[PDB]
Design a protein around this ligand. Structure first.
Ligand SMILES: Nc1ncnc2c1ncn2[C@@H]1O[C@H](COP(=O)(O)OCCCc2ccc(O)cc2)[C@@H](O)[C@H]1O
Length: 528
């Protein structure tokens, strides 16, 4: 009956005519000599001035090697200063950045490059072997940041290019700048088109305003142990950090012992994490061997946070305020943010994932009738605002079933909003499986299984797991006289997919339960 929810914070001014790099580096002059990017693994450091200049050099270098405005560049790198420099340089060039986990298989990397139409791939030499075959076969340029195996280019060709040769580019706020992949509410992984305006809006919703929803001040140091090739770290850590002028302490590889030492050494104050990471930190027996007094904020997002883990963290890190952030790639990605993180904080309740961001609208709809619901009534969470995606790359039908005719993005998540405007996520409508914060699309694994000569049908479902949250398991229908075993099938999948998409168990059945239409009755399967 038309119930629209909004933030408890007032709307603020958000630019509608600026390129992403111009916006996040807008107040550069106020802290140009300050550390911007710090590699916690090797000590490398770039000041804000260094970053701004290098981004322009990268843009000049990209043009020099034939990369044009509108072209897609694919990063195959771990979180690092290099990733950020490449991203900002591409933005300055009017180019687009798509990225994949460097631990992806050769099959995944090629499929990603082909689907995104990447014209350049940037990675590390230790991962080059996985792109070699594809490289010298698709005419795509390959570049490495360390050594330059074969005839690949070197990243210095970009970082050390002449900034005076940076091409003059006219960038529209509606131009796409990032292309993260996501399976959305159903189906296979798709390219999510995020624009300059969309990302700017999402960043502003989090850190701008007299009373920012996510308050980061001058003395803060933000930890980046999450992957920049995914939206959480890209937006809430990288872009938000740059916008507020805070130094970003990057950890290319998560290691408890090292992290604790880095927190003391660099006085890390903000720790954006995911449940799996939080649990590892909590189980650490060395918390007393380091001074972690600088930590003042721990933000969990990307997956459900159980009460027990929430209680454990509050008990082990009493010097910090614990809270959640709720986001979805297609949403820009932040939908709601803990108001206890605001400059002038609001009270919050345990288990809540935050309050809908300002400069946006949220509604909860009955999954079957589409009707809007009032407070305390669970339904599908929908959001509308300039921060959402433009749409899915080359996939109009997927876009049409995700963003409705009135501009509302449908999340596939079930939740409700209480009397204090705090949002609670209680279930999931969509088939998405989440392993340690990573997306595991059942349809993707299903397609791979069915491609097997001895498999006629299959269905993949998520199995509850204390350590990863959910682990994928498969129900398989073998061909008539197949002698294939559980382990043989698992090995078949393990060789083609990234480590976290491996199927934990294979159950053989006679048929996959489907609706009269043909849709897989996943509810039935999960029910064993
Ligand atoms: N706080 C949460 N609690 C429960 N479930 C969540 C939460 N956060 C995200 N999810 C689930 O994860 C799905 C989206 O998966 P995607 O890989 O596209 O984005 C993952 C990143 C989400 C994020 C980004 C920026 C932030 O500041 C905080 C979180 C949501 O639809 C939910 O199903």
């Amino acid at each position: 009956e038309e119930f629209i929810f909004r933030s408890k914070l007032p709307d603020i001014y958000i630019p509608k005519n600026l390129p992403l790099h111009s916006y996040v580096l807008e107040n550069l002059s106020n802290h140009s000599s300050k550390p911007c990017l710090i590699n916690g693994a090797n000590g490398d450091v770039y000041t804000y001035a260094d970053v701004e200049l290098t981004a322009r050099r990268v843009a000049s270098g990209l043009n020099k090697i034939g990369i044009q405005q509108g072209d897609v560049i694919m990063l195959f790198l771990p979180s690092s200063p290099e990733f950020v420099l490449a991203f900002l340089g591409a933005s300055h060039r009017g180019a687009i950045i798509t990225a994949a986990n460097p631990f992806s298989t050769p099959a995944e990397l090629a499929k990603h490059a082909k689907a995104s139409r990447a014209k350049l791939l940037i990675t590390q030499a230790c991962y080059y072997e996985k792109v070699k075959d594809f490289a010298r076969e698709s005419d795509v340029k390959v570049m490495c940041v360390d050594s330059a195996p074969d005839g690949c280019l070197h990243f210095s060709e970009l970082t050390q290019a002449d900034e005076n040769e940076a091409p003059q580019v006219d960038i529209s706020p509606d131009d796409v700048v990032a292309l993260p992949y996501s399976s959305g509410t159903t189906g296979l992984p798709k390219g999510v088109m995020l624009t300059h305006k969309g990302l700017i809006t999402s960043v502003a919703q989090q850190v701008d305003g007299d009373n920012p929803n996510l308050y980061f001040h001058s003395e803060d140091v933000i930890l980046c142990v999450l992957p920049m090739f995914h939206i959480y770290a890209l937006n809430s850590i990288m872009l938000c950090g740059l916008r507020v002028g805070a130094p970003i302490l990057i950890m290319p590889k998560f290691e408890i012992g090292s992290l604790l030492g880095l927190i003391e050494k660099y006085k890390v104050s903000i720790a954006p994490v995911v449940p799996p990471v939080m649990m590892s930190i909590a189980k650490s027996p060395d918390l007393d061997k380091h001074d972690l007094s600088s930590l003042r904020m721990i933000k969990s997002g990307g997956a459900p946070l159980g009460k027990e883990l929430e209680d454990t963290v509050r008990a082990k890190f009493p010097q910090a305020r614990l809270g959640q952030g709720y986001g979805m790639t297609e949403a820009g990605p932040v939908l709601a943010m803990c108001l206890a993180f605001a400059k002038e904080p609001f009270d919050i309740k345990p288990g809540a994932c935050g309050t809908v961001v300002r400069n946006a609208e949220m509604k909860i709809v009955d999954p079957e009738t589409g009707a809007s619901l009032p407070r305390n009534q669970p339904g599908e969470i929908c959001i509308r605002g300039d921060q959402i995606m433009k749409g899915y790359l080359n996939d109009p039908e997927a876009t049409s079933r995700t963003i409705d005719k009135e501009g509302w993005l449908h999340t596939g998540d079930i939740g409700y909003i209480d009397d204090d405007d705090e949002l609670f996520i209680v279930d999931r409508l969509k088939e998405l499986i989440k392993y340690k914060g990573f997306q595991v699309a059942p349809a993707e694994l299903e397609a791979l299984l069915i491609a097997h000569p001895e498999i006629s049908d299959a269905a993949v479902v998520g199995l509850k797991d204390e350590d990863a949250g959910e682990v994928p398991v498969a129900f398989v229908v073998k061909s008539e006289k197949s002698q294939a075993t559980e382990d043989e099938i698992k090995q078949y999948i393990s060789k083609q997919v990234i480590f976290y998409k491996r199927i934990k168990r294979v159950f053989f059945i006679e048929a996959i339960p489907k609706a009269p239409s043909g849709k897989i009755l996943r509810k039935n399967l999960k029910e064993k």
